[PDB]
């Protein structure tokens, strides 16, 4: 399964699930971690969760690849590691809030 | 604390701890998640762990920011979320192996 085909699956799925700000970062000549990183926002916890889970299910259906998901059920963010592509999903207002708390030195 | 200053701290720290393939991805005009993503490799579990922990300690010492670390103590990868910068660390031979297992459909 071609990494460009995987990229198309990822962005099509996120677009279908109404993600915003879907960014594609090509990593050729920069990093060996993956061919692409994709980053996108969701508007709620239900939405980020549905987004991530459907994407993992779709990748498995299309390719057989079992993606690693980091950050569920508490879904302020999700990372989905699909091997050739790593997908970052975030809730902008939750992230800005948590970043402030960490800037203030909370939590150690 | 300036995001360019934070970037310099991150890359200087990773360089000092002998990370390889240190990639800087500017996100201006692409994603709101952060100003930069940094990706780098380490050669062992001790090294990736030392790398990530020292970077978190250094960010806190220099800025007060308490970074969120994902993927320790089992350190095949680490993500360090420093707010304005997200840092991905990976062990190339471990990642290639785990990616194969997921490609083969292991683990659900």
UniProtKB/Swiss-Prot annotation, chains A, B:
Keyword terms of this UniProt record: Cytoplasm, Repressor, Translation regulation
Gene Ontology terms for molecular function: ribosomal large subunit binding
Included stretch of the parent chain: 14 to 121 of 133
Full protein name: Ribosomal silencing factor RsfS
Location of the protein in the cell: Cytoplasm
Function: Functions as a ribosomal silencing factor. Interacts with ribosomal protein uL14 (rplN), blocking formation of intersubunit bridge B8. Prevents association of the 30S and 50S ribosomal subunits and the formation of functional ribosomes, thus repressing translation.
Quaternary context: Interacts with ribosomal protein uL14 (rplN).
Cysteine pairs bridged by disulfides in the record: none
GO biological processes: cytosolic ribosome assembly; negative regulation of ribosome biogenesis; negative regulation of translation
GO (cellular component) term, any one: cytoplasm
Keyword Repressor applies: yes
Family: Belongs to the Iojap/RsfS family.
Record's keyword annotation contains Secreted: no
Cleavable signal peptide: none
Natural source organism: Zymomonas mobilis subsp. mobilis (strain ATCC 31821 / ZM4 / CP4)
Top-level taxon of the source organism: Bacteria
